[PDB]
Amino acid sequence: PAYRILKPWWDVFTDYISIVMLMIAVFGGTLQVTQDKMICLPCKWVTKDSCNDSTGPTGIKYDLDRHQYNYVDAVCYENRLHWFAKYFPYLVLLHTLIFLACSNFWFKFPRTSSKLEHFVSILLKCFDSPWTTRALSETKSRIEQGIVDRSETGVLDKKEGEQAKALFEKVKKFRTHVEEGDIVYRLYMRQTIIKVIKFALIICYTVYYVHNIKFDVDCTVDIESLTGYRTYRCAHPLATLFKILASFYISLVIFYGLICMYTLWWMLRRSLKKYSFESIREESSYSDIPDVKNDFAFMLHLIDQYDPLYSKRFAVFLSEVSENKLRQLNLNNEWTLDKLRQRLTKNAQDKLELHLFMLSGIPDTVFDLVELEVLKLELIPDVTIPPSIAQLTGLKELWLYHTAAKIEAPALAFLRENLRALHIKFTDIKEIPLWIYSLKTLEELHLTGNLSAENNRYIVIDGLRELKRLKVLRLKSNLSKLPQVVTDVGVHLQKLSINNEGTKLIVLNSLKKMVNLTELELIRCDLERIPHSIFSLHNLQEIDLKDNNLKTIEEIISFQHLHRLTCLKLWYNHIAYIPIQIGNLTNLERLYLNRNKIEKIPTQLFYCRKLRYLDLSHNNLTFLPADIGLLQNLQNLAVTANRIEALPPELFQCRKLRALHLGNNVLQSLPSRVGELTNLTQIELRGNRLECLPVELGECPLLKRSGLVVEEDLFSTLPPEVKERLWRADKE
Amino acid sequence: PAYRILKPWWDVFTDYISIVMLMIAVFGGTLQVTQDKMICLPCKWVTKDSCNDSTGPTGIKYDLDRHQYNYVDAVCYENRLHWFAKYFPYLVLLHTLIFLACSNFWFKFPRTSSKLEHFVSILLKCFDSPWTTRALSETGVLDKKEGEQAKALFEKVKKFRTHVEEGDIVYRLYMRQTIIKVIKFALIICYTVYYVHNIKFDVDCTVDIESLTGYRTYRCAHPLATLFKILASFYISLVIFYGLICMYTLWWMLRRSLKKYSFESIREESSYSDIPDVKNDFAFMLHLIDQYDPLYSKRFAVFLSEVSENKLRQLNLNNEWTLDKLRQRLTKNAQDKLELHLFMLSGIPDTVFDLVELEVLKLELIPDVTIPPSIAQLTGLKELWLYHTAAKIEAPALAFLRENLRALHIKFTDIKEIPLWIYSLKTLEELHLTGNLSAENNRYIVIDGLRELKRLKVLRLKSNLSKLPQVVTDVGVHLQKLSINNEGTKLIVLNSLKKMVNLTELELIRCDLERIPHSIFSLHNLQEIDLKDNNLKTIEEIISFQHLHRLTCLKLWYNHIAYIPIQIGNLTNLERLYLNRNKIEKIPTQLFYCRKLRYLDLSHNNLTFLPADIGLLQNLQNLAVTANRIEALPPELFQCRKLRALHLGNNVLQSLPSRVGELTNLTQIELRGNRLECLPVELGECPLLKRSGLVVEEDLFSTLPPEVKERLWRADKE
Amino acid sequence: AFRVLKPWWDVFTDYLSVAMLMIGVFGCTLQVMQDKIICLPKRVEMKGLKTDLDLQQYSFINQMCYERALHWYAKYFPYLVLIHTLVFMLCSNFWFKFPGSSSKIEHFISILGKCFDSKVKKFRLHVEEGDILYAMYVRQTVLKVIKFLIIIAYNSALVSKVQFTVDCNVDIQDMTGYKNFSCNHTMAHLFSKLSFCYLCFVSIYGLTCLYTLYWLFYRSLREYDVKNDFAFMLHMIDQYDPLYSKRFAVFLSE
């Protein structure tokens, strides 16, 4: 059947030689069982019990019937014919049969038979694997920049790809099961040694006893009571033929022994418990081809003896590079374009998003959706951007999450002209691609993860000076000093963000060289104080200093330097008092001072008439100064989680109050002037100590239940018409 | 199986001759085993161990019992009968067995059996390939599956040729087999002819047993002897044939020198020039197959050739790209032209030459595309894009392109990716070279063939050129548009740009000049200048712009310009002025001396007031102050009745003036991003206004009366 | 339903039975063709001892002495071996010639192949209701052990009965003139070694049966969960190949 490839040439030779040796055994047996006789004549003159060997001549009358001749023939043949001459064919038959049993011990034995049949089936199906020949047909600034050579892609069918995957799985399972065994090799060694020793024994004892087969014999059987003669001389007719057969048999056995000795010598010299495997991969440059252990190097050597090519067709199937390539191809054929379009989402910035989280690799089917805008790749190991990314015309932002991403020359060419934003989240410095600094159109760059280093800190990012068109920068690395590269490159940056998330940062007067800056966010930098140099940024418009453990903000009196300071965020601190000096800040339009310990609202604060957003929640505030009418531009006020229990009338003097957050307070009652808030859209009241809601609330032009945050119990107090109109606005 | 094609006629004849020889060997063997014997009678009168041969006749009495006759028969048979008369059939059987071993040695020997089965499996599928018959008929339309199978078989043939040509084992085994057959035939004929006459019917034996029979010599008959002789003769004759044939094969194996296969007859007749000579160990199998039959060699020649593979690839590609889908993907660019964009293909499809309406061809990342003469099928083509592909061209194609091409786009990742032949064209007028050709000590040498493009009028450079190339100055004697983009790299001229007198447009984008070079002011023919994103901070050099008498447009946007010098008022000719994306907070009044100004864009600046002189410009058609701190529109800004564009977004305007309705040429205005209480109804009286032209929030757009909104929706509909 | 059902000891028994049948056929052929007894009358430079007996008288004496004197075991050893080997082979193959087991094992092989490709609920109902197949196999192995023991025990004594020389005192007088005859059985000394080889083969057969006894009576294969029939039919395939049990246990798991 399929086991023809198991047998080397020396095994086929022994098979045929055993067939011939058994054929001559059968011939000898069938010749002897029928035609083997002895022809005896007695000797009349006997001296010392031997044939004395002592007018035309005449015959010699022995006076014997033919039956007496038959009797003496039988007796003499039974007694004085050498046992080897009488049993040579049976000995030959037995030796041939045991030779054949040795040659087929490891096949009829089901234990190793299972291993051999599994191996031959797997090797056969891998030899005819369609993807194997295709994989074979696949056949210094650039290396250190993170740029790799071109990768060649084709197209594959679904069913044959699944067949290749299943074949890979079967190969993995088989190598797991068989590599440990080292059983078939031991049985093969036992069989070879048994054959060698049996050949030695027979080649000895035969050539010892072959001289016994002689044409003529002398037998002294001592039966005179039946015949009257003592000694007979007899002839063995087949003796010469048996001698010829014995010589031919020992010549065949000598050939068999030579072949077995060659097999033993080869197996001992090779040391084939681990296959070398180096030449094939060294020629093919497939480095994921380890040397296999016992019970699998022996089979490799056998199949190599049958045909070397059969090793190569398996070698590519034992490589991890081939596994990666086939898996990547089945992945490319896996994600349907419809599945991708269903997986397309919309982000907060009205852009199309494809978030690839923990996949095998980048599917090249996603490069067909030309409408993609933002690309997020989370936890894909060491991927490389193919040139096909040039098809994504609408791509603007690239997000990398712990991916040591590489790129190719055409893909880098495209991203040199079509990339605007780059987000990097790296746990290790090596994960940062080094080809990013050649992107001459990159405007927004984000870096997340500890880049902190000793004696080389802020040196790996010195390529930031090359991104001339860089505008945005956000850093989340628990740093303590401003990088020199960022200090130099900030001259053209419009926004710089740092999130030390605990580490105390020192500006070291390195911030005031970035005069073009407009936004500056420093969250959880543990500043404990506003450094002076910030005021030297004359173009700043907003500033957030959240969670810096601030106790005094009296320094904001310097903010008169900024003629375009639009907003100032100081939430999430220990702020207990708002200094009156903020009255100098006439340009303030928004302000945030929540999560603090503020108890009162200073009256001078109401000198900032341009305020439109005020959020001072989570404070000890307990009253509202009457000067709220001064701030006619206010649209959103939050007093959530405060001690507010009264409302001055001037609260309702702001007719453009768009929304309010007045819940989670201790407000006992609401003044009836609520209807004055003609621009009220959303309101919050949950948590207040109210009893009855005002009817004048129900006349608000923009009031809706979704914009009505209040307990349903207190909401029940409203007129039924108010509830009905609220529900109608909910439905409409 | 299909081994009958690997057996020539002579091997079949030897196979049958061996069967007949084995048959007579078995016949002789069973005769000798069963019925062979001698019949011996003693001679009474013996003279020198020889029978002397010296009332009616009477029987001669020997006085011997039957068993004595058996004994003398056995002894005389053992001793005096010639061994060649007893062991003839066994020798015949042995010789036949070793002859059969020689004939079938290479088949059982696995090392050559693998090669033989490999070749005979490949040849069968190469014989019955559906593509083979059509290729023979062609000296069309096919299935995708059959083309894929043909390509796979081409791969198999390549790998098989590489695997087999190197070996040289089958031929050695065949040579040794035939040598052994011939020499053993010589031995057996020699000795058998020598000994065949020693089979005699009657034999005389002097066996030297007188103590048992009393006689010296015996005369005996060997009954089978005559029959054996016949077989012996009937054997040697067969061997003679089995000799001659083998000899012939030896000569046949030593006459043609079959290690090499010429193959030239079929490639000559069927015109397949890519049919190479095959080296050892592979010509032999083809020779044997041809000796069986020549058709299989023909059916293998097509797959062995190389032009056949290219033709199959082309046919598969053409079948895949049908005209229907090719037209479906063929769309129009934004420049109002019909362009073809083939991206990352194996090669140039032959169906794309099916059109005469093509004028733009875009080939990107398509390796080793050879430009055929068939590109002549489209004569009006004038634009061609070659991105990341150096295409090989032909003489008819080059001659066609030397007169009928106008735009060539060359985006190259490497210096070698620029084809040289593009320098030979004479009627070219639009050129584009993208790729960093800047190199150390070989600067601007890849562009040496630019001199011959005399007809050129447009030249664009995005090649990271640190300095101004000299060949650019050479070609600037007749240019009409020069675009230079260094991707932010600092560009240095130093008196190398003023020599292009005939230039009409200049664009130095992101050249990082940081300061205007004076050479530009020498170009009196220059009319429009673009210096986008060069970090300009002081632009007082515009006072020299009076030397440009046709300067109507200036582009100095995306820079760090702090203030606009009032001297720009001397440039009365200007209609389009672009200075947006800068650091400008105040607008000089003298700038409004240019009443010809039509395009004024100053978005993304620090503006807070609009001067009253902004209305002095009647030709003001476009206004863009988006992302600024403007508080209100000055009344004079409504003097320009033909203000056909208005960009007011991201501004802190509190109220919209009612004079906007006085503008009836208003075609588009964007109001999104402004802090406006409500929409004045005057905006609704503009005849040219539409809903799509207006940009404003719906919740405030509804504040207009329902009549105005319905009229606007109707005007938007049709 | 052919290969997986044969444990290695079963294959050894099959091969030994084939060899024994070959030996029996060879012995029968020798008995048919070349079996004869040569006889001489006991008692009537050297001379002859002419007993003046015709050839026909010699043949009559031969037939009489051969039919009477020669031991029955010498005359019927080949047919005895033939019958024993036929009984062994018939007993072994009766387990599959029986239609009921042919219905059971066919379904078992179908379900095993289906479980290997990647009914079991019905299988554990209709098949686990058995355990008579395990008992049948145990009884067949016990019967084979009984046969081996009986054969060896009674044959080791009668093997020495066959002798080259032999004597017969037959009342052939007044037909030939003698009463006592010395005869020889020509093939007796060959039959001795033939029977010795047959005894060795039977001994190895019995040792294989004894090891099958160890396999059947060491770990109470009635339980393994599955009933006795299913546990036995699982142990069989496990012995043939240790892997198939892992791929069959999957579908039982819920």
* Residue B49, C-beta contacts closer than 8 angstroms, at least 6 positions apart: B206, B216, B217
Nearest CA-CA partner of B574 in B590, B562, B558? B590
Please check whether residue A588 is in contact with residue A608, taking contact to mean a CB–CB distance below 8 angstroms: yes
The SS3 call for residue B162 is: helix
The DSSP line for A639-660 is -TTS------GGGGG-TT--EE
Binary contact (A71, C50; C-beta < 8 A): no
And the tokens for A650? 């001037």
Query: Alpha-carbon distance B47 to A357, whole Å?
Result: 118
Residue with tokens 């069959």: C248
Please check whether residue B85 is in contact with residue B198, taking contact to mean a CB–CB distance below 8 angstroms: yes
Q: What are phi and psi of A596, to 5 degrees?
A: -125, -170
Binary contact (A57, B215; C-beta < 8 A): yes
Burial of B283: CB neighbours in 10 Å, binned 0-12, 13-18, 19+: buried
Please check whether residue C49 is in contact with residue A226, taking contact to mean a CB–CB distance below 8 angstroms: yes
Please check whether residue B306 is in contact with residue A349, taking contact to mean a CB–CB distance below 8 angstroms: no
Would you mind telling me the total number of residues written for chain B in this entry? 718
A70 close contact with C: CB closer than 8 A? yes
Query: Alpha-carbon distance B615 to B603, whole Å?
Result: 18
- Number of CB atoms found within 10 A of residue B319's CB: 16
- Number of CB atoms found within 10 A of residue B364's CB: 21
Render the burial of A528-560: b for 16+ CB within 10 Å, e for the rest: eebbeebbbbebbbbbbbbbbebeebeebeebe
Nearest CA-CA partner of A85 in A247, A240, A242? A242
Please tell me what DSSP assigns to residue A94.
Answer: H
Nearest CA-CA partner of A466 in A438, A434, A495? A438
And the tokens for A409? 């020359």
H and E: helices and strands count for chain A: 19, 22
- Is the Cα torsion angle B597, B598, B599, B603 positive or negative in sign? positive
The SS3 call for residue B357 is: coil
Nearest CA-CA partner of B249 in B199, B189, B190, B180? B180
And the tokens for C204? 């190895």
Q: Which chains have 3+ CB pairs within 8 A of A?
A: B, C
Nearest CA-CA partner of A157 in A326, A402, A352, A381? A326
Please tell me what DSSP assigns to residue C106.
Answer: H
The SS3 call for residue A595 is: coil
Q: Are strands B39-42 and B505-509 parallel, antiparallel or unpaired?
A: unpaired
The SS3 call for residue B42 is: strand
A140 close contact with C: CB closer than 8 A? no
HSE at residue A177, side-chain half, CA atoms within 13 A, is 15
HSE at residue B192, side-chain half, CA atoms within 13 A, is 25
A–B touching, 3+ CB–CB pairs within 8 Å: yes
Nearest CA-CA partner of B259 in B335, B376, B175? B175
Query: Alpha-carbon distance B501 to B521, whole Å?
Result: 11
Please check whether residue B242 is in contact with residue B185, taking contact to mean a CB–CB distance below 8 angstroms: yes
**CA closest to A40 among chain B residues:** B71
Element of type H or E holding B646: strand B645-647
Q: In what order do the strands lie in the sheet with A229-235?
A: A39-42, A229-235, A216-223
Selected residue of C5, C43, C46, C196 to mutate for chain A interface (largest A Cβ count, 10 A): C46
C241 closest CB neighbour out of A42, A63, A114? A114
Rg from Cα positions in chain A: 51
Nearest CA-CA partner of A710 in A676, A660, A643, A673? A660
Q: How far apart are the CA of A44 and the nearest CA of chain B, in angstroms?
A: 9
CA dihedral A228, A230, A233, A235 (to 10 degrees): 70
Query: Alpha-carbon distance C144 to C208, whole Å?
Result: 10
Nearest CA-CA partner of B401 in B343, B341, B348, B361? B361
Query: Alpha-carbon distance A299 to A116, whole Å?
Result: 9
Q: How far apart are the CA of B513 and the nearest CA of chain A, in angstroms?
A: 14
The SS3 call for residue A683 is: strand
Nearest CA-CA partner of A294 in A400, A179, A209, A377? A179
Element of type H or E holding B226: helix B225-255
Nearest CA-CA partner of A707 in A668, A679, A670? A679
Residue with tokens 């048959």: B23
Q: Are strands A229-235 and A39-42 parallel, antiparallel or unpaired?
A: antiparallel
Using an 8 Å CB-CB cutoff, list chain C residues near A227: 40, 48-49
Please check whether residue B475 is in contact with residue B449, taking contact to mean a CB–CB distance below 8 angstroms: no
And the tokens for B317? 């590609």
Please check whether residue B428 is in contact with residue B455, taking contact to mean a CB–CB distance below 8 angstroms: yes
Provide the strand spans (E) within B566-701.
Answer: 576-578, 599-601, 622-624, 645-647, 669-670, 694-695
Strand partners, B51: B46
And the tokens for A36? 């083997």
Nearest CA-CA partner of B570 in B585, B557, B551? B551
The SS3 call for residue A482 is: coil
* Residue B622, C-beta contacts closer than 8 angstroms, at least 6 positions apart: B598, B599, B600, B601, B643, B644, B645
Please check whether residue A659 is in contact with residue A707, taking contact to mean a CB–CB distance below 8 angstroms: yes
- Furthest C-alpha separation in chain B: 181
The DSSP line for A128-155 is T-HHHHHHHHH--HHHHTTB--------
Q: How far is CA C17 from each of CA A210, A320, B475, C27, C200, rounded to the nearest angstrom?
A: 33, 51, 102, 15, 12
Residue with tokens 């011996």: B40
Query: Alpha-carbon distance A703 to A695, whole Å?
Result: 12
Query: Alpha-carbon distance A135 to A322, whole Å?
Result: 7
**CA closest to B490 among chain A residues:** A468
Please check whether residue B559 is in contact with residue B582, taking contact to mean a CB–CB distance below 8 angstroms: yes
B75 closest CB neighbour out of A133, A235, A244? A235
Binary contact (B68, A59; C-beta < 8 A): yes
B110 closest CB neighbour out of A61, A133, A306? A306
Element of type H or E holding A259: helix A239-270
Selected residue of C16, C38, C51 to mutate for chain A interface (largest A Cβ count, 10 A): C38
Please check whether residue B506 is in contact with residue B523, taking contact to mean a CB–CB distance below 8 angstroms: yes
Q: Are strands B576-578 and B553-555 parallel, antiparallel or unpaired?
A: parallel
Nearest CA-CA partner of A671 in A654, A657, A688, A652? A652
C243 closest CB neighbour out of A71, A114, A224? A114
* Residue C229, C-beta contacts closer than 8 angstroms, at least 6 positions apart: C127, C128, C129, C130, C131, C132, C133, C134
Binary contact (B487, A440; C-beta < 8 A): yes
Please tell me what DSSP assigns to residue B492.
Answer: B
Query: Alpha-carbon distance A555 to A527, whole Å?
Result: 14
Resolved by: cryo-EM
A391 closest CB neighbour out of B70, B343, B411? B343
CA dihedral A12, A15, A17, A22 (to 10 degrees): -170
And the tokens for B481? 């548009």
Please tell me what DSSP assigns to residue A290.
Answer: P
Nearest CA-CA partner of A382 in A144, A154, A148, A168? A148
Query: Alpha-carbon distance A644 to A662, whole Å?
Result: 9
And the tokens for B717? 């509909």
Binary contact (A388, B344; C-beta < 8 A): yes
Provide the strand spans (E) within C104-154.
Answer: none
A59 close contact with C: CB closer than 8 A? no
Query: Alpha-carbon distance B576 to B623, whole Å?
Result: 11
Rg from Cα positions in chain B: 52
Please check whether residue A464 is in contact with residue A440, taking contact to mean a CB–CB distance below 8 angstroms: no
* Residue B645, C-beta contacts closer than 8 angstroms, at least 6 positions apart: B621, B622, B623, B624, B667, B668, B669
Give a three-class secondary structure readout of A41-86: EECCCECCCCECCCCCCCCCCCCCCHHHHHHHHHHHHHHCCCHHHH
Please check whether residue A328 is in contact with residue A290, taking contact to mean a CB–CB distance below 8 angstroms: no
Q: How far apart are the CA of B86 and the nearest CA of chain A, in angstroms?
A: 10
* Chain-centroid distance, C-alpha A510: 45
Query: Alpha-carbon distance A329 to A334, whole Å?
Result: 8
Binary contact (B77, A233; C-beta < 8 A): no
H and E: helices and strands count for chain C: 9, 3
**CA closest to A310 among chain B residues:** B114
Render the burial of A675-698: b for 16+ CB within 10 Å, e for the rest: bbbeebbbbbbebbebeebbebbb
Strand partners, B669: B646, B694
The SS3 call for residue B220 is: strand
Nearest CA-CA partner of A488 in A503, A504, A466? A466
Selected residue of A53, A61, A63, A70 to mutate for chain C interface (largest C Cβ count, 10 A): A70
Please tell me what DSSP assigns to residue B370.
Answer: B
Residue with tokens 């302000």: A591
Amino acid letter for position A690:
L
A45 closest CB neighbour out of C45, C47, C243? C45
Using an 8 Å CB-CB cutoff, list chain A residues near C241: 110, 114
Binary contact (B212, A41; C-beta < 8 A): yes
* Chain-centroid distance, C-alpha B155: 12
Please check whether residue B71 is in contact with residue A59, taking contact to mean a CB–CB distance below 8 angstroms: no
Using an 8 Å CB-CB cutoff, list chain B residues near A51: 211
- Furthest C-alpha separation in chain A: 179
Binary contact (C184, A75; C-beta < 8 A): yes
**Helix intervals (H) in A158-238:** 158-178, 184-209
Q: How far is CA A197 from each of CA A96, A107, A185, C228, rounded to the nearest angstrom?
A: 14, 21, 18, 47
Please check whether residue B350 is in contact with residue B321, taking contact to mean a CB–CB distance below 8 angstroms: no
Residue with tokens 């490319």: A332
* Chain-centroid distance, C-alpha A628: 63
And the tokens for A195? 């054959």
* Residue B655, C-beta contacts closer than 8 angstroms, at least 6 positions apart: B632, B676, B677
C–B touching, 3+ CB–CB pairs within 8 Å: no
Using an 8 Å CB-CB cutoff, list chain A residues near C30: 33
State the distance between the two ends of chain C, measured CA to CA, in whole angstroms: 27
Residue with tokens 């050249």: B511
- Number of CB atoms found within 10 A of residue A575's CB: 21
Q: How far is CA A450 from each of CA A427, A458, C52, rounded to the nearest angstrom?
A: 7, 11, 127
Query: Alpha-carbon distance C34 to C29, whole Å?
Result: 8
Query: Alpha-carbon distance A95 to A89, whole Å?
Result: 10
And the tokens for A588? 């303030």
Provide the chain A residues 24-43 that lie in CB contact (below 8 A) with chain C: 33-34, 42
Q: Are strands A374-378 and A397-401 parallel, antiparallel or unpaired?
A: parallel
Q: How far is CA B431 from each of CA B101, B382, B474, B484, B716, rounded to the nearest angstrom?
A: 76, 11, 15, 12, 42
Q: How far apart are the CA of B30 and the nearest CA of chain A, in angstroms?
A: 10
Using an 8 Å CB-CB cutoff, list chain A residues near B45: 56
- Is the Cα torsion angle A515, A520, A526, A529 positive or negative in sign? positive
**CA closest to C62 among chain A residues:** A67
Element of type H or E holding B434: strand B430-434
Query: Alpha-carbon distance A555 to A535, whole Å?
Result: 10
The SS3 call for residue A231 is: strand
Breaks (C-N over 2.5 A) in chain C follow: 44, 118, 224
Using an 8 Å CB-CB cutoff, list chain C residues near A45: 45
Cα three-residue angle C72-C76-C81, rounded to 5 degrees: 135
And the tokens for A64? 């014997």
Amino acid letter for position C33:
M
Burial of A500: CB neighbours in 10 Å, binned 0-12, 13-18, 19+: buried
Query: Alpha-carbon distance B365 to C43, whole Å?
Result: 117
The SS3 call for residue B467 is: strand
C46 closest CB neighbour out of A66, A87, A228? A228
Please check whether residue A673 is in contact with residue A652, taking contact to mean a CB–CB distance below 8 angstroms: yes
Cα three-residue angle B163-B166-B167, rounded to 5 degrees: 90
Please tell me what DSSP assigns to residue B466.
Answer: S
CA dihedral B205, B208, B214, B216 (to 10 degrees): 50
State the distance between the two ends of chain A, measured CA to CA, in whole angstroms: 80
Provide the chain C residues 153-172 that lie in CB contact (below 8 A) with chain A: 164
Residue with tokens 């020499």: B183
**CA closest to A469 among chain B residues:** B488
Residue with tokens 């606007």: B712
